[PDB]
């Protein structure tokens, strides 16, 4: 995976939006197109609406999701069976 030296990756525009809200009694949804961004522990408690190609899917970030990309929780293809 991504080299340990490089550290974990998150887009600064997304990281800024979460940082602006950390000290918030009531959080609000963060609309993002950054599927590539890693879920940091600071994301826990937020709902990040992730673009899946056509819409923003609201994903609630539980502490069990840390380390996974935001895109892992916004499937791009719809398949209900043949």
């Amino acid at each position: 995976g991504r080299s340990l030296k490089k550290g974990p990756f998150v887009d600064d525009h997304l990281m800024k939006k979460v940082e602006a809200q950390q000290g918030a009694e009531k959080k609000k949804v963060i609309k993002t197109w950054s599927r590539r961004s890693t879920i940091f522990p600071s994301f826990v408690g937020f709902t990040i609406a992730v673009y899946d190609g056509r819409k923003h899917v609201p994903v609630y970030i539980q502490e069990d999701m840390v380390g996974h990309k935001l895109g892992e929780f916004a499937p791009t293809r719809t398949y209900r069976g043949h």
Binding site: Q62, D64, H68, G71, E72, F73, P75
Partner: protein, 114 residues
Amino acid sequence: RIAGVDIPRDKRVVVSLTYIYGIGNTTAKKVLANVGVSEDVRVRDLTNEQTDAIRAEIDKLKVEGDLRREVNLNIKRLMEIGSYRGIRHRRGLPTRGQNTKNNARTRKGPTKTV
């Protein structure tokens, strides 16, 4: 016998240990080198001192039921958080990016020509 598994008595120790879930070829060599048991002796020839040394060595590692619960918990987590991988696990499809238009028979099971 060693970790609750009757390892093959006729085989050499390096291989007999591999019949333990969580011990592969490389791990078997490591535990024998630590205990000091020659790799070529059939386990039928292992003395109680050698067997107990192996059991002591193996007890350090995570094997058998302990390993199986550990891995199943990992998959359980992927499903619970609703990740893409978890859905792949739950729907019986390849989880590591493999194409499914063809092949994927290991995950899917036998062909349903219908």
